[model samples]
Target: AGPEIRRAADNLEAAIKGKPLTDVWFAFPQLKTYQSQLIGQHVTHVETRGKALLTHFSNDLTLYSHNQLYGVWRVVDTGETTRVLRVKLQTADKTILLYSASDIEMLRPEQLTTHPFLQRVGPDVLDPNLTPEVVKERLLSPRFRNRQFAGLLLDQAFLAGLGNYLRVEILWQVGLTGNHKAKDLNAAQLDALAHALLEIPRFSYATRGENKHHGALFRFKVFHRDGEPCERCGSIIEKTPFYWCPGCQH
Candidate 1:
């Protein structure tokens, strides 16, 4: 989901960067006031913080939206959508539409720091500067160290850009189960986890979630492979709500 969000943001930036808005519309009446503020303003950039999307305008306004469940973004040649459209931005030749997103906000650049979702989310896993040491430090922090991996990995306040599948993959890669807490891991296990947390998502993003490596495909060791033999230990992978290799993952 995080990589998908990043891909959408990149696509949006490519379509409208430096292009002035010819038309802007919002389905919600409260957001309709922003149409005038957004028109005639050039789109400077589109950014993603975890799963949240921010589209910056030259006029110093930023449009923020989170595609929680059923939301989708589409860049099209025409603005003809029979589906539930939430927001629409038109350039000279292209139209960008956000459909079915419930959480949308218009804020000044300065307000981003205080925004509810952005302010609370932890460091993004895909951020190039997020070193493994920082991840280990967060793992050891009192705020997070005591929590179990199953729920902790899904918490945005613990680490951004991770969803359910990533949680399973990262836990499996570290040779740990979702039942393990950060405090329960030794130094070496922590190191491995810190590295895997950063590595897995970056790899997924680079390969577009295809799980390809060394010219092979579907390299996932445990996820969605329930009842299949574990590649490392020959034990059947099982899903107790989360897929894992019980043979090797302690």
Candidate 2:
């Protein structure tokens, strides 16, 4: 989901970056006042943290929106659309529309530190600067070392941008199961787990989530492969809500 959000953010930035907004509209009454605040400013760029999107403007304002399950963003030729539009941003030649998104807000750049979602999200897994050492440190930290990988990997407070599929894939990558606790890992296992934590997400992001172009190492070993044989040990994969190699992943 993070890769998907990142891809959408890239498309949005290309459509709007550096161009002054000629018009702006909000379907929500509470956000209607932001129309004037946004109309004359140029969009600097679009950024994503986990599943949330941040649209930055030249006037030091940021538009934050979480698509949750129903939101959709589209760049269309005509400003008019049949869908239930939540926000409409228009430049001289392009129109960007957000539809069915209920979680939308306007905030100053400094205020992002206190924003509810932004405040709690951990370091983004897709961040280029997020090294394995940092991940290893977090794994061994008191706040997280006691947690099991099954639910911990899904916690944005643990590592932002990881979702269900990533949880399954990362564990398989390190030959560990969701039952494995961070503190239980040995030095070598911890290193491998930390590397996989960063590596798997980057691989998924790089391949646009299809992951078909790379070698076996980049291929997902367990996720969505329930009933298939484990590639490493030739044992049938099983799903306890997450596909894993019971034969090889301890």
Candidate 3:
């Protein structure tokens, strides 16, 4: 899932950048005959919002794939056994991207009319349409009735594209307890949480894991620095044996 999540977003962004693709064998775990056709016909660009993937290919057709809980993709190439996490696109003649996903799916504009996934996915924090209501409703959804606030926010269905670290980072930065139940947060608190999650991912990706973007983006106290003191509040943010504050979580 890690490789697929990163590679899909990266490769799709590259294609949008006018990248040259001679041969790319990428598998999307969700399979649909119509989606395959549409992707082949008009998917000229793709983007990942949260963990949801949007492939814009036709006038009224787009393929939306969600890496909900367990979806993943792996890229394999020659001499990879001794290599690092990333596969050099230039070095590999054929990059085998495996998308071992269950809900692998396809969506056209018409499906938006008939199917409920698009409409059901609350206002993605990435979209310009995000509003207080959208943010609030996302937090209040039934799909996340029992999760810790941190886990609920990390689910892409709530706002898309977030993962475990993003959850921890955003929760800690917001000065909230990780054990806080989702229902316990007020609308205002939820809004702030969503906003922070939205902004942090862009900052982290742009700096390529660098912390000095504008000197305030990647300052880690609880994320990568497990045993370090909280960088902002000076509370000695020790890494909980479970990486979550028991006081605030379930």
Candidate 4:
């Protein structure tokens, strides 16, 4: 999910770089508009942090948005048809349409750390700075260690960019169950779990969800694969909104 948003920011940067903001519009009435605030401001840079896109301008304000499931950004010709257009940014050569996202906002450069969303999110999974040691530290922290393993893995506050699928697969690879408490993990177990969070998502990003292990048994060994044989054992994989292998992932 984070990787996909990074790609959108990459494409957006390529489309709008050096181009002045000719116009801005939004369909959502409650959210503030950038039209008057951003007119004639050149795009200085575009960045992706976790699942959100941050567009920087020469005026020192940034446009931030998240692509949660139905949200998308598209660069199209002036009259291109769309299902819904929530916000639009027009440059001299292209029009960028942001559709159906409710979490769009403007933040000053200094306020990035103070913004409600940016301040609470954990380290981005795709961020190169997220090393194994960092993951280990976060996983072993009291907040995570005090919680159930599965729910902790799914918590964005534990590690941002982990969606449901990623958390399910990560727990499977780490051989953990939802009933297990994070604080009970031995050092070796914590090492393995930390490494999985760092490596698995990187594999998914590189392979575009075609990441498979265990001799091509399945792209994912347990996610959404309830009642299927466990890749590590013959026991069936089960899910109660949290997939686990009864035999091996306990």
The candidate scoring highest on lDDT is 1
Q: lDDT per residue, candidate 1, 72-163, as tens digits?
A: 99998755556699989998988899998999999896787678888677767886647899899879977688999999889888788887
Better of 2 and 4 by lDDT: 2
TM per candidate: 0.54, 0.53, 0.46, 0.53
TM-score of 4: 0.53
- Rank all candidate structures by their TM-score, best first, as comma-separated numbers: 1, 2, 4, 3
lDDT of 4 at 223: 84
lDDT of 3 by residue, 77-108 (tens): 43433222211221223232324444444566
Name every residue pair that clashes in candidate 4.
none
Best of the two (2, 3) by TM-score:
2
RMSD of 4: 8.1
The Cα local distance difference test for each model comes to 0.84, 0.83, 0.51, 0.77
Quote model 3's TM-score.
0.46
Where does candidate 1 have its weakest 10-residue lDDT segment?
Answer: 209-218
RMSD of each: 8.0, 7.6, 10.6, 8.1
The worst-scoring run of ten residues by lDDT in candidate 2 lies at 208-217
When summed lDDT is taken over every stretch of 10 residues in candidate 4, the lowest stretch is 209-218
